[PDB]
Write a protein that binds this ligand. Structure first.
Ligand code: HEM
Length: 152
Protein backbone atom coordinates (compact mmCIF):
# COMPACT_ATOMS: atom_id res chain seq x y z
CA UNK A 1 0.00 0.00 0.00
CA UNK A 2 1.46 3.28 -1.21
CA UNK A 3 0.29 6.82 -0.62
CA UNK A 4 -0.42 9.19 -3.49
CA UNK A 5 2.88 10.96 -2.86
CA UNK A 6 4.70 7.65 -2.99
CA UNK A 7 3.04 6.75 -6.28
CA UNK A 8 4.03 10.20 -7.54
CA UNK A 9 7.66 9.38 -6.74
CA UNK A 10 7.48 6.00 -8.48
CA UNK A 11 6.10 7.46 -11.64
CA UNK A 12 8.67 10.25 -11.53
CA UNK A 13 11.45 7.66 -11.35
CA UNK A 14 9.75 5.69 -14.08
CA UNK A 15 10.14 8.70 -16.40
CA UNK A 16 13.89 8.12 -16.23
CA UNK A 17 13.44 4.53 -17.41
CA UNK A 18 11.04 5.48 -20.23
CA UNK A 19 13.64 7.84 -21.73
CA UNK A 20 15.78 4.79 -22.53
CA UNK A 21 13.75 1.65 -21.94
CA UNK A 22 16.07 -0.65 -23.90
CA UNK A 23 19.23 0.54 -22.20
CA UNK A 24 17.66 0.23 -18.76
CA UNK A 25 16.14 -3.14 -19.63
CA UNK A 26 19.45 -4.46 -20.94
CA UNK A 27 21.30 -3.40 -17.82
CA UNK A 28 18.64 -4.87 -15.51
CA UNK A 29 18.94 -8.26 -17.21
CA UNK A 30 22.74 -8.16 -17.29
CA UNK A 31 22.83 -7.35 -13.56
CA UNK A 32 20.47 -10.27 -12.88
CA UNK A 33 22.35 -12.79 -15.03
CA UNK A 34 25.85 -11.88 -13.86
CA UNK A 35 24.87 -11.50 -10.21
CA UNK A 36 22.73 -14.66 -10.08
CA UNK A 37 23.94 -17.01 -12.84
CA UNK A 38 21.27 -19.62 -12.03
CA UNK A 39 18.69 -17.21 -13.49
CA UNK A 40 20.25 -17.50 -16.94
CA UNK A 41 19.39 -21.22 -16.98
CA UNK A 42 15.67 -20.38 -17.06
CA UNK A 43 16.12 -18.75 -20.49
CA UNK A 44 16.61 -21.28 -23.24
CA UNK A 45 17.27 -18.37 -25.59
CA UNK A 46 19.99 -16.79 -23.43
CA UNK A 47 21.76 -19.81 -21.92
CA UNK A 48 24.26 -19.66 -24.81
CA UNK A 49 25.59 -16.35 -23.50
CA UNK A 50 28.81 -17.17 -21.68
CA UNK A 51 30.41 -13.75 -21.17
CA UNK A 52 29.01 -10.35 -20.31
CA UNK A 53 30.44 -9.03 -23.60
CA UNK A 54 28.20 -11.48 -25.43
CA UNK A 55 25.29 -10.35 -23.24
CA UNK A 56 25.99 -6.67 -24.01
CA UNK A 57 26.23 -7.40 -27.74
CA UNK A 58 22.99 -9.39 -27.80
CA UNK A 59 20.20 -7.52 -29.53
CA UNK A 60 17.67 -10.13 -28.48
CA UNK A 61 18.57 -9.58 -24.81
CA UNK A 62 17.92 -5.88 -25.21
CA UNK A 63 14.63 -6.75 -26.90
CA UNK A 64 13.57 -8.91 -23.97
CA UNK A 65 14.59 -6.17 -21.57
CA UNK A 66 12.14 -3.92 -23.43
CA UNK A 67 9.36 -6.53 -23.08
CA UNK A 68 9.98 -6.90 -19.35
CA UNK A 69 10.15 -3.23 -18.51
CA UNK A 70 7.16 -2.40 -20.71
CA UNK A 71 5.11 -4.94 -18.75
CA UNK A 72 6.36 -3.62 -15.41
CA UNK A 73 5.64 -0.02 -16.39
CA UNK A 74 2.08 -0.92 -17.32
CA UNK A 75 1.61 -2.49 -13.91
CA UNK A 76 3.17 0.47 -12.05
CA UNK A 77 0.98 2.99 -13.89
CA UNK A 78 -2.05 1.27 -12.34
CA UNK A 79 -0.98 2.46 -8.86
CA UNK A 80 -1.86 -0.86 -7.24
CA UNK A 81 -5.06 -1.58 -9.20
CA UNK A 82 -3.26 -4.19 -11.27
CA UNK A 83 -5.14 -7.49 -10.82
CA UNK A 84 -5.90 -7.96 -14.54
CA UNK A 85 -2.34 -7.12 -15.65
CA UNK A 86 -0.66 -9.15 -12.93
CA UNK A 87 -2.72 -12.35 -13.11
CA UNK A 88 -1.42 -13.56 -16.54
CA UNK A 89 2.19 -12.84 -15.60
CA UNK A 90 1.88 -14.68 -12.30
CA UNK A 91 0.32 -17.59 -14.17
CA UNK A 92 2.91 -17.73 -16.95
CA UNK A 93 5.79 -17.38 -14.51
CA UNK A 94 4.49 -20.09 -12.17
CA UNK A 95 3.25 -22.63 -14.71
CA UNK A 96 5.32 -22.16 -17.87
CA UNK A 97 8.58 -20.46 -16.98
CA UNK A 98 8.77 -21.89 -13.43
CA UNK A 99 10.37 -18.80 -11.92
CA UNK A 100 10.66 -18.99 -8.12
CA UNK A 101 9.66 -15.89 -6.18
CA UNK A 102 13.32 -15.60 -5.10
CA UNK A 103 14.27 -14.58 -8.63
CA UNK A 104 11.66 -11.80 -8.55
CA UNK A 105 13.35 -10.52 -5.39
CA UNK A 106 16.66 -10.66 -7.31
CA UNK A 107 15.30 -8.64 -10.24
CA UNK A 108 13.72 -6.13 -7.86
CA UNK A 109 17.05 -5.43 -6.19
CA UNK A 110 18.67 -5.31 -9.63
CA UNK A 111 16.30 -2.52 -10.72
CA UNK A 112 17.37 -0.44 -7.71
CA UNK A 113 21.03 -1.13 -8.48
CA UNK A 114 20.68 -0.08 -12.09
CA UNK A 115 18.85 3.12 -11.17
CA UNK A 116 21.72 4.19 -8.92
CA UNK A 117 24.28 3.15 -11.54
CA UNK A 118 22.70 5.12 -14.41
CA UNK A 119 21.51 8.10 -12.33
CA UNK A 120 24.06 8.53 -9.52
CA UNK A 121 23.09 11.30 -7.17
CA UNK A 122 19.72 11.63 -8.94
CA UNK A 123 17.87 8.70 -7.25
CA UNK A 124 17.13 10.12 -3.82
CA UNK A 125 16.27 8.39 -0.59
CA UNK A 126 12.57 9.16 -0.96
CA UNK A 127 12.51 7.86 -4.54
CA UNK A 128 14.30 4.65 -3.54
CA UNK A 129 11.85 4.16 -0.67
CA UNK A 130 8.79 4.48 -2.88
CA UNK A 131 10.21 2.38 -5.74
CA UNK A 132 11.16 -0.37 -3.29
CA UNK A 133 7.64 -0.39 -1.84
CA UNK A 134 6.13 -0.62 -5.32
CA UNK A 135 8.30 -3.59 -6.23
CA UNK A 136 7.40 -5.21 -2.93
CA UNK A 137 3.69 -4.82 -3.70
CA UNK A 138 4.21 -6.32 -7.15
CA UNK A 139 6.15 -9.26 -5.70
CA UNK A 140 3.65 -9.79 -2.88
CA UNK A 141 0.66 -9.95 -5.19
CA UNK A 142 2.52 -12.43 -7.39
CA UNK A 143 3.34 -14.43 -4.25
CA UNK A 144 -0.36 -14.71 -3.41
CA UNK A 145 -1.04 -16.19 -6.85
CA UNK A 146 1.93 -18.54 -6.48
CA UNK A 147 0.42 -19.78 -3.21
CA UNK A 148 -2.98 -20.36 -4.83
CA UNK A 149 -1.20 -22.53 -7.47
CA UNK A 150 0.97 -24.35 -4.93
CA UNK A 151 4.07 -23.25 -6.79
CA UNK A 152 7.41 -23.09 -5.02
C1 HEM B 1 9.81 -7.41 -13.14
C2 HEM B 1 9.53 -8.70 -13.30
C3 HEM B 1 9.33 -9.30 -14.63
C4 HEM B 1 8.46 -8.94 -15.63
C5 HEM B 1 7.38 -7.87 -15.52
C6 HEM B 1 8.46 -9.99 -16.57
C7 HEM B 1 7.72 -9.92 -17.78
C8 HEM B 1 7.72 -10.89 -18.78
C9 HEM B 1 6.90 -10.91 -19.95
C10 HEM B 1 5.99 -9.77 -20.35
C11 HEM B 1 7.20 -12.03 -20.64
C12 HEM B 1 6.56 -12.46 -21.94
C13 HEM B 1 5.12 -12.98 -21.75
C14 HEM B 1 5.04 -14.15 -20.81
O1 HEM B 1 5.60 -15.22 -21.14
O2 HEM B 1 4.31 -14.09 -19.78
C15 HEM B 1 8.28 -12.67 -19.95
C16 HEM B 1 8.86 -13.84 -20.36
C17 HEM B 1 9.74 -14.54 -19.57
N1 HEM B 1 10.05 -14.29 -18.27
FE1 HEM B 1 9.57 -12.79 -17.20
N2 HEM B 1 9.28 -10.98 -16.18
C18 HEM B 1 9.85 -10.63 -15.01
C19 HEM B 1 10.81 -11.32 -14.25
C20 HEM B 1 11.37 -12.52 -14.66
C21 HEM B 1 12.40 -13.23 -13.98
C22 HEM B 1 12.87 -12.97 -12.56
C23 HEM B 1 12.75 -14.32 -14.78
C24 HEM B 1 13.87 -15.29 -14.64
C25 HEM B 1 14.90 -15.15 -13.83
C26 HEM B 1 11.89 -14.31 -15.91
C27 HEM B 1 11.86 -15.27 -16.88
C28 HEM B 1 11.06 -15.19 -18.02
C29 HEM B 1 11.21 -16.17 -19.11
C30 HEM B 1 11.93 -17.51 -19.03
C31 HEM B 1 10.42 -15.74 -20.11
C32 HEM B 1 10.25 -16.39 -21.47
C33 HEM B 1 11.27 -15.86 -22.49
C34 HEM B 1 11.07 -16.48 -23.84
O3 HEM B 1 11.55 -17.61 -24.02
O4 HEM B 1 10.99 -15.73 -24.84
N3 HEM B 1 10.98 -13.27 -15.75
N4 HEM B 1 8.48 -12.03 -18.72
Amino acid sequence: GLSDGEWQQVLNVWGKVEADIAGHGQEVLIRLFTGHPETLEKFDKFKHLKTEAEMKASEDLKKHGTVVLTALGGILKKKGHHEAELKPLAQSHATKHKIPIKYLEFISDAIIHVLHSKHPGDFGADAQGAMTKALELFRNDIAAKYKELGFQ
